[PDB]
Amino acid sequence: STGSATTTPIDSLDDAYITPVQIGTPAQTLNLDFDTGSSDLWVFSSETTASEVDGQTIYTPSKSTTAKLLSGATWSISYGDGSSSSGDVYTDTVSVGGLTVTGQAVESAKKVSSSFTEDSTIDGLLGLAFSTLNTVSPTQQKTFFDNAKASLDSPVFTADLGYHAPGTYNFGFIDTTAYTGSITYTAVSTKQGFWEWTSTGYAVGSGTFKSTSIDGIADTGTTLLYLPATVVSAYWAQVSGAKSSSSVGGYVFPCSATLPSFTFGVGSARIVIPGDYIDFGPISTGSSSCFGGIQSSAGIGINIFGDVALKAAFVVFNGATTPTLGFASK
Numbered sequence: 001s002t003g004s005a006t007t008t009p010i011d012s013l014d015d016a017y018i019t020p021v022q023i024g025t026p027a028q029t030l031n032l033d034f035d036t037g038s039s040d041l042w043v044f045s046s047e048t049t050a051s052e053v054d055g056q057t058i059y060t061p062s063k064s065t066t067a068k069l070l071s072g073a074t075w076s077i078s079y080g081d082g083s084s085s086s087g088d089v090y091t092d093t094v095s096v097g098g099l100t101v102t103g104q105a106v107e108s109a110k111k112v113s114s115s116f117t118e119d120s121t122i123d124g125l126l127g128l129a130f131s132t133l134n135t136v137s138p139t140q141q142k143t144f145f146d147n148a149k150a151s152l153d154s155p156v157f158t159a160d161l162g163y164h165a166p167g168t169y170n171f172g173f174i175d176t177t178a179y180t181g182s183i184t185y186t187a188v189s190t191k192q193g194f195w196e197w198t199s200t201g202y203a204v205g206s207g208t209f210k211s212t213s214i215d216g217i218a219d220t221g222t223t224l225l226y227l228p229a230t231v232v233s234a235y236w237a238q239v240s241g242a243k244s245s246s247s248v249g250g251y252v253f254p255c256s257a258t259l260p261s262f263t264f265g266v267g268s269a270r271i272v273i274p275g276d277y278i279d280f281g282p283i284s285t286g287s288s289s290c291f292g293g294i295q296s297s298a299g300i301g302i303n304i305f306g307d308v309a310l311k312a313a314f315v316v317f318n319g320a321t322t323p324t325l326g327f328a329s330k
């Protein structure tokens with residue numbers, strides 16, 4: 001089997017992407033944030049504290065004839081940005097772009113943190129990291145990909161995120177018309193539960209490539225590109241007036257600037273992030289200070305190849321017995 005679904009930016013900055021997901025019988029369609037950096041499929045629901053719901057579409061398990069309470073199971077997750085959610089668990093039928101999993105754990109939120117409430121466009125998350133990170137207790141549950149894998153034509157999914165435009169998540173096949181040149185594959189460590197890999201280096205604008213190993217995660221659920229302070233300093237040094245602002249919480253730059261591109265290495269291959277992809281707009285409405293899309297990972301504890309990097313590529317998440325990651329230009 002295969003599936004194919006369009007993923008759409010939630011706003012004009014590409015802060016996140018939502019993908020429609022069918023849950024239950026009859027289908028209830030929710031728009032979920034596909035997150036290769038976590039491993040829980042959770043949704044706003046009829047059980048979510050009413051004051052914490054503000055415009056989201058909810059899943060109502062009592063209206064699904066295929067929903068079954070997973071007795072005794074709870075979940076609770078905290079994300080790197082400080083947000084969180086928790087609740088109980090149903091199993092139900094879940095379909096993405098024509099690909100159906102029966103008995104998928106659907107984690108129903110009883111509580112969500114303010115950042116989730118405040119984002120009316122995201123109805124939940126669909127985790128696509130390794131199932132070892134799943135938070136369901138006392139019996140850990142598998143991700144949608146994990147459950148689907150055996151049935152897929154090939155045990156893979158791909159992320160093709162758009163810049164200020166829709167893109168695609170495919171399951172079970174590689175669309176050879178969706179990228180240019182070849183896909184370069186690189187080793188993955190699953191030891192931390194992530195799609196963790198090592199970039200071979202970077203360049204800033206038309207500058208020379210610096211060969212250096214950068215270990216990080218391919219994370220569709222993180223907006224920006226978080227890299228070591230040395231790398232980030234070298235980038236922003238090429239932008240007149242750019243500076244790190246402790247009060248804003250990262251590098252900012254004059255909105256009048258033209259940003260240089262940023263290149264990252266995948267083996268001997270190179271992915272070029274255009275300068276425009278690194279502009280996250282005014283820090284506050286009407287400001288002439290703009291927020292940068294490349295930020296330091298110092299104090300996160302891990303480098304994160306978030307949407308800013310991933311949307312510059314066609315990305316293969318290869319879930320073969322030894323997982324790998326593939327990157328192509330597009």
Ligand SMILES: NNC(=O)c1ccccc1Cl
Pocket residue numbers: 035036037038079080081219220221222302
């Ligand atoms: N979607 N990404 C995550 O949940 C994550 C994983 C590891 C470190 C930091 C973060 Cl923000």
